[PDB]
């Protein structure tokens, strides 16, 4: 917070650290899904509608 108010005070802009964490909920059901995303869906354990997991953000994820 204060980092933001300082930067403002010094005529600058504290641009925040990119989020390292996201939560993913799957909202589409299980029929008619294309093979590629379907695979990725399972490798994040989202294999059933409204189920959700955490994901660490890197380029690879």
């Amino acid at each position: 917070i204060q980092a933001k108010r300082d930067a403002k005070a010094a005529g600058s802009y504290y641009v925040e650290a990119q989020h390292k964490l996201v939560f993913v909920v799957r909202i589409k059901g299980i029929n008619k899904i294309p093979p590629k995303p379907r695979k990725v869906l399972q490798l994040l354990r989202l294999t059933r509608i409204n189920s959700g997991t955490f994901v660490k953000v890197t380029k690879a994820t």
């Binding site: 909920v25 409204n50 189920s51 997991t53 955490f54």
Partner: protein, 60 residues
Amino acid sequence: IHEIITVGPHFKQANNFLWPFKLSNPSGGWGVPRKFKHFIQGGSFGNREEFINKLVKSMN
């Protein structure tokens, strides 16, 4: 919890330990007519950023 929110060293093994969360459907509703457009286009699907909380909390 800490090991998650901070990511950090054994996040992997911490998070994997965690069985996928079984949320309900959103009590309150999805807040949009059709869900299978993007959040930017009028609702659901894609990164809705720090809006995910209001969503999850109603599915929780």
